Amino acid sequence: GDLINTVRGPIPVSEAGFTLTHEHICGSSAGFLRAWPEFFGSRKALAEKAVRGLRHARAAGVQTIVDVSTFDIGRDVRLLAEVSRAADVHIVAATGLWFDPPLSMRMRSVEELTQFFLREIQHGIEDTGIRAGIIKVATTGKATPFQELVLRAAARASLATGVPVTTHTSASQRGGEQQAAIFESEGLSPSRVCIGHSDDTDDLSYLTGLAARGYLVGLDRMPYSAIGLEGDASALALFGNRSWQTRALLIKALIDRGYKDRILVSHDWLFGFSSYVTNIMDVMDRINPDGMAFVPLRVIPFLREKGVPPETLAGVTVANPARFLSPT
Amino acid sequence: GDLINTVRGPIPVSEAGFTLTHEHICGSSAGFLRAWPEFFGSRKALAEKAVRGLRHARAAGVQTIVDVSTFDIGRDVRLLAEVSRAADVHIVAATGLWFDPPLSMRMRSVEELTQFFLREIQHGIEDTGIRAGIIKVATTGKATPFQELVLRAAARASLATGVPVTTHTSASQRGGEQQAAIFESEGLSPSRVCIGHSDDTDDLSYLTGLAARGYLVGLDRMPYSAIGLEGDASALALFGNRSWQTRALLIKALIDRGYKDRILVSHDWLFGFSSYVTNIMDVMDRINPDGMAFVPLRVIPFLREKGVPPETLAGVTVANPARFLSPT
Ligand SMILES: [Co+2]
Ligand SMILES: [Co+2]
Ligand SMILES: [Co+2]
Ligand SMILES: [Co+2]
Numbered sequence A, B: 001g002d003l004i005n006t007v008r009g010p011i012p013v014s015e016a017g018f019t020l021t022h023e024h025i026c027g028s029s030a031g032f033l034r035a036w037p038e039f040f041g042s043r044k045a046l047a048e049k050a051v052r053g054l055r056h057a058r059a060a061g062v063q064t065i066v067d068v069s070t071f072d073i074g075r076d077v078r079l080l081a082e083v084s085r086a087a088d089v090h091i092v093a094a095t096g097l098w099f100d101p102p103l104s105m106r107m108r109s110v111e112e113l114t115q116f117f118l119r120e121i122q123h124g125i126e127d128t129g130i131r132a133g134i135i136k137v138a139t140t141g142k143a144t145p146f147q148e149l150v151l152r153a154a155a156r157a158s159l160a161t162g163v164p165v166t167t168h169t170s171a172s173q174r175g176g177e178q179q180a181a182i183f184e185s186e187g188l189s190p191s192r193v194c195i196g197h198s199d200d201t202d203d204l205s206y207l208t209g210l211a212a213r214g215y216l217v218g219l220d221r222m223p224y225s226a227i228g229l230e231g232d233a234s235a236l237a238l239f240g241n242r243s244w245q246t247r248a249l250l251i252k253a254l255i256d257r258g259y260k261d262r263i264l265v266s267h268d269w270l271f272g273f274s275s276y277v278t279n280i281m282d283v284m285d286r287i288n289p290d291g292m293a294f295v296p297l298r299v300i301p302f303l304r305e306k307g308v309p310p311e312t313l314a315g316v317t318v319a320n321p322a323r324f325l326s327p328t
Helices: A043-059 A077-087 A110-123 A145-161 A175-185 A204-212 A233-238 A244-256 A280-287 A291-305 A310-325 B043-059 B077-087 B110-123 B145-161 B175-185 B204-212 B233-238 B244-256 B280-287 B291-305 B310-325
Strands: A003-006 A009-012 A019-023 A064-067 A090-092 A094-096 A134-138 A165-168 A193-195 A216-219 A263-265 B003-006 B009-012 B019-023 B064-067 B090-092 B094-096 B134-138 B165-168 B193-195 B216-219 B263-265
Touching: A003 A090, A019 A263, A019 A291, A019 A310, A043 A077, A043 A291, A064 A310, A077 A090, A094 A110, A094 A145, A110 A145, A134 A145, A145 A165, A145 A175, A165 A175, A175 A193, A175 A204, A204 A216, A204 A244, A216 A244, A233 A280, A244 A263, A244 A291, A244 A310, A263 A310, A291 A310, B003 B090, B019 B263, B019 B291, B019 B310, B043 B077, B043 B291, B064 B310, B077 B090, B094 B110, B094 B145, B110 B145, B134 B145, B145 B165, B145 B175, B165 B175, B175 B193, B175 B204, B204 B216, B204 B244, B216 B244, B233 B280, B244 B263, B244 B291, B244 B310, B263 B310, B291 B310
Parallel strands: A019 A064, A064 A090, A094 A134, A134 A165, A165 A193, A193 A216, A216 A263, B019 B064, B064 B090, B094 B134, B134 B165, B165 B193, B193 B216, B216 B263
Antiparallel strands: A003 A009, B003 B009
């Protein structure tokens, strides 16, 4: 009976199935794929790449992704609808604002940003009628004044609609703690919030402190590792130096500590990427040729071999996304 | 025989007539009018406002404007084409980058930015086939590293196409001097470059130094004055404290010094403005209800009353734009 909005229209909650909760078709900037599609070879090439990659994920058991691209990540909801149809994978679109708002967003009040986020959830994105099913926000450590307005507008849009909030943060700066403080000052329930990029640290005091408070903890960059590429400074800065198995052990660490219901797993993958260095796709595709099938192909069996029960893994990959995405 | 690209297609140089060389339909951000047109009431309201204002300018004798909105000013070339048709005023569109490039532009090399600017001049903007007729760039004082790449890519696109380059600068910081240094290091002729916002200062050593070197000097913010509003800090910061008559005396100062062929006059007006404080249109429309008719209605007669000959004023408003816009 409960429903989630996707770029193809409403679906029953129970059909979302195995869901990757932090992904992107294309990491770009507002207006960019319309103005310069040849950056990606062509729009058609980008769409075909994305359809191949979603088909691969689907073969591996993924049924839904949440594309957390905001306005300022260059979200193109028509592209999402096209590739969702072609690949037969559900895609949930996002509203919110990430790190790159333009001036026309940076000048706005909390009330104005609230109406923008509500427009995209309740009315539709652009002129398409496609409704966002999640609100994405971002900080590093200490929230800037504008980021604090974004977080408050996200909380107010979530309270009005039931749609959840998901975050980018700097895990090494324990950024989720200030996010949580702002959301709670707005009366937002922690059960509506995922603190993302939490696998970028092994700081289990930070992670268990959020989980104990009821937050979802997004272990969402599973394939990110610059091991083997450490002379590529741009790769190292984005990916890192920890292995995927190190990241995946955090899923088991939280389950072992009683927090299985508080975990969301994903890749933070993409099929095009213009907001970083030229050719970064190419580096990424070498680190992780499986793309968005890496979680079911590598991470889930690794955890099953370490003794995590199948029921617990189904709860993390199916039940927890369903409860998070259901408007509540 | 010479031709200029407009948003309606090619026109003869000689039909551009009285031309305002630095204007905007809407000062916004990439993607913004598509994502949040209700910020402006509606897209239809914005277009109707712009058509009324261009009709008023046309009645006052304006035949062409150059809309120097770049990608990151939220240029919407379909909007420009619509309002140009409805108002029967030619509009030249721009490529280049202003102060608000997103990450997908800020990561690019000089070679990449060159191909983007060339795309918009030679192929067309977005999927529209509408060709830019000018390249807009921006700095304040000292160019940032990325701004220097923008200026070099603009110079290289101009050398390949003949299209001119026009600038935003901080006149109080004499920013045109560093712009000129970069353009000349690229081999760009000063005759292809307008150093804009030059009426924001009364520093005639700065202005005559550029004019002597062959630059066009853009006296382009004629109606900008916060006199009467000086308690509105945002108005003061953008407009200022000098009167329009003070700004217009710079046109006569340069003519009196022998630089009549080096002057371009405009308003830097707009019909919508989302990249600044909410309601700024409203403040602007009170300072200058004549909009883009203020130059022919107020500035030209003021100069004629101070004894500038009609032939000289025709040369500034017709001949100088034609020579500047003609690809050369
Ligand atoms: Co992120
Ligand atoms: Co992401
Ligand atoms: Co400017
Ligand atoms: Co301007």
